[PDB]
Amino acid sequence: SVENLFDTYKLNDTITLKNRILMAPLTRCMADANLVPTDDMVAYYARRAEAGLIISEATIIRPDAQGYPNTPGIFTQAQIAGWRKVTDAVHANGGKIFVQLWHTGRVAHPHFFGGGDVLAPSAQKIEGSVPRMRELTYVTPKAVTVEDIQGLVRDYAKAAENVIEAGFDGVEIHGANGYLIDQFLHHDSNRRTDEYGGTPVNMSRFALEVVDAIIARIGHDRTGLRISPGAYFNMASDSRDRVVFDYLLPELEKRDLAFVHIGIFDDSIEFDYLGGTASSYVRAHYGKTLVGVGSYSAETASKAIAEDKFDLIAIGRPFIANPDYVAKVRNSEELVAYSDEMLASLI
Ligand SMILES: Cc1cc2nc3c(=O)[nH]c(=O)nc-3n(C[C@H](O)[C@H](O)[C@H](O)COP(=O)(O)O)c2cc1C
Ligand SMILES: CCCCCCCCCCCCCCCCCC
Ligand SMILES: O=Cc1ccc(O)cc1
Ligand SMILES: O=Cc1ccc(O)cc1
Ligand SMILES: O=Cc1ccc(O)cc1
Ligand SMILES: O=Cc1ccc(O)cc1
Ligand SMILES: O=Cc1ccc(O)cc1
């Protein structure tokens, strides 16, 4: 029995979720050439409105954030209007939805933004080329200046302002999976020697400035944050990263966020540096609402939540394979297994 997945969950005084099931953020690369959400995307999200909360696909805050084709933005008026169609449709279906605010940092590619500079904490290139594209090899980033950083914080904040007009219920800040914010939090990517590098406090500074700037626009009850304390996605490991997160997590708790959400693909994986799984590490260092994710079945998620491992379950791939995931779980019906080939279709 997975009855607990259907518990009401009060995130805070502003938002109550009708169940504990989140749609995980899932990049689909289906926005139009102006990175405006399409009417097909409207229908796609609308049919998943039985989720307690949808986290949108990663949505770029400005042009030099783009690293994959046709990933939507939230920085132009047309993009805002396109997202308003999405959020209106989700709300009309009785759902709720947060936008996931993205900057890819060193994982951006200048093909998408007129040959401009890729930005990151340090001039540390990742290996390889953009997946599913022809020959877009990653480039050495420019190490951001403090002025670049001020502009990036400003643009995260402006993107958050824009979510009001776009009609989202809130923002998940994408601080995970090797992207810009996570790049400041890990030694592989952050080799800085200024006030944004070196020590846990300094390496956490960018993340906290972005969190605080966004709270100043939309409020703590509408702000969540995804983190990846375990390096796995465009990030080499470093044994010193754990103490960065040991500092960051209690600082985050002071902000009384809507949630922290783990970014991982299989949370059954143990990280030596974290003393175990990513979720168990965070749960041991953070005492507010936690969203688990990564290769959970409804059954294993339900058990984890019953065992106080985390509070809410995000479901990714099964929500692609099963638009009616929530109803099928509710009714104990067969679920289709995900395959990567399903990404070809937006259903
Ligand atoms: C096709 C695909 C795209 C994804 N896009 C994002 C993304 O936009 N933002 C993000 O934070 N995670 C992204 N993820 C990771 C998922 O949110 C999730 O953490 C992962 O799929 C594990 O959960 P699952 O086992 O339920 O699928 C993506 C995963 C997949 C498979
Ligand atoms: C878009 C569909 C599939 C996406 C590709 C996979 C992305 C996640 C895996 C990346 C690297 C994982 C290897 C983990 C190393 C460290 C584990 C302790
Ligand atoms: O470069 C950032 C940017 C922000 C808002 C826009 O409308 C266009 C670009
Ligand atoms: O470049 C195509 C590609 C597809 C799936 C992957 O997992 C990796 C790369
Ligand atoms: O963060 C989104 C938001 C939406 C409606 C509001 O009234 C305030 C904030
Ligand atoms: O596959 C695309 C992808 C984008 C953002 C993520 O965080 C993870 C995966
Ligand atoms: O939408 C494409 C698709 C591909 C393979 C499947 O098994 C199901 C759907």
Side-chain angles (χ1 to χ4, degrees):
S1 171
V2 300
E3 46 188 323
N4 62 352
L5 300 183
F6 295 93
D7 293 343
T8 299
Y9 192 92
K10 184 173 181 169
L11 280 183
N12 49 51
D13 293 336
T14 305
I15 300 171
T16 291
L17 309 183
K18 69 186 175 196
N19 60 59
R20 298 186 188 259
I21 300 166
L22 268 55
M23 181 186 180
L26 299 157
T27 286
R28 304 305 307 268
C29 296
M30 297 282 175
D32 78 14
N34 299 131
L35 315 180
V36 176
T38 65
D39 296 302
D40 289 330
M41 289 167 62
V42 173
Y44 166 77
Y45 284 113
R47 67 178 61 98
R48 290 166 171 77
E50 295 194 6
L53 178 63
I54 292 160
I55 311 301
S56 82
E57 65 205 85
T59 295
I60 60 167
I61 65 173
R62 74 190 200 180
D64 72 4
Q66 194 177 355
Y68 308 86
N70 300 108
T71 58
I74 194 160
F75 56 90
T76 70
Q77 177 53 51
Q79 286 160 5
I80 291 170
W83 280 118
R84 184 59 175 254
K85 292 190 288 185
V86 175
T87 67
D88 280 352
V90 168
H91 293 326
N93 286 356
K96 298 185 174 78
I97 180 167
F98 275 24
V99 66
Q100 191 189 53
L101 292 186
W102 202 18
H103 195 294
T104 57
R106 67 183 181 167
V107 193
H109 198 284
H111 167 83
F112 296 115
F113 55 96
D117 290 338
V118 169
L119 300 183
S122 298
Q124 291 295 325
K125 187 182 77 64
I126 59 171
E127 296 293 329
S129 62
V130 178
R132 311 187 201 259
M133 300 290 294
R134 173 189 65 214
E135 306 156 12
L136 297 188
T137 56
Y138 288 118
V139 302
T140 301
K142 193 198 82 180
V144 287
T145 71
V146 158
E147 303 102 346
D148 286 316
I149 288 169
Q150 295 157 3
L152 282 158
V153 175
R154 167 202 68 204
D155 290 343
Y156 272 108
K158 182 48 167 183
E161 283 171 8
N162 290 345
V163 318
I164 302 177
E165 183 181 356
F168 288 97
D169 295 288
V171 165
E172 176 177 282
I173 296 164
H174 195 347
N177 301 342
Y179 295 113
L180 181 65
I181 291 165
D182 196 37
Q183 289 159 35
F184 282 89
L185 295 169
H186 295 269
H187 282 92
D188 177 36
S189 45
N190 185 351
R191 318 252 174 131
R192 301 178 73 89
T193 60
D194 69 354
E195 61 271 28
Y196 290 89
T199 67
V201 177
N202 286 359
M203 293 176 67
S204 293
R205 188 179 308 283
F206 184 73
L208 293 172
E209 291 179 334
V210 171
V211 166
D212 290 344
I214 286 172
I215 288 174
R217 302 327 193 272
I218 66 175
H220 77 293
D221 281 355
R222 297 189 187 274
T223 306
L225 176 66
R226 208 173 203 205
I227 58 171
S228 293
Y232 76 109
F233 197 127
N234 294 313
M235 190 65 69
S237 62
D238 188 303
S239 73
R240 303 170 296 170
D241 294 345
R242 188 219 170 103
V243 294
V244 178
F245 286 85
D246 285 352
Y247 167 84
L248 178 68
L249 284 165
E251 282 296 305
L252 289 172
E253 189 157 349
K254 296 179 184 182
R255 279 74 173 172
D256 191 29
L257 299 178
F259 53 83
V260 168
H261 182 182
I262 304 296
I264 195 59
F265 275 61
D266 185 350
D267 192 38
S268 298
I269 292 168
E270 296 171 350
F271 294 87
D272 295 302
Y273 294 158
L274 305 179
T277 61
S279 58
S280 73
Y281 165 76
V282 177
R283 192 60 151 191
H285 291 81
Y286 184 77
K288 291 180 172 285
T289 295
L290 183 60
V291 182
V293 73
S295 297
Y296 286 97
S297 64
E299 290 78 13
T300 62
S302 171
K303 203 74 187 314
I305 291 166
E307 294 181 351
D308 196 27
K309 304 298 185 69
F310 51 82
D311 305 297
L312 296 168
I313 176 69
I315 296 294
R317 286 164 291 182
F319 248 128
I320 293 176
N322 306 272
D324 53 341
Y325 180 87
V326 177
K328 291 187 152 200
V329 169
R330 188 177 65 244
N331 292 306
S332 300
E333 294 184 5
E334 292 292 359
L335 291 167
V336 177
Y338 171 87
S339 62
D340 184 84
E341 288 97 332
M342 293 174 175
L343 298 174
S345 299
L346 192 66
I347 297 166

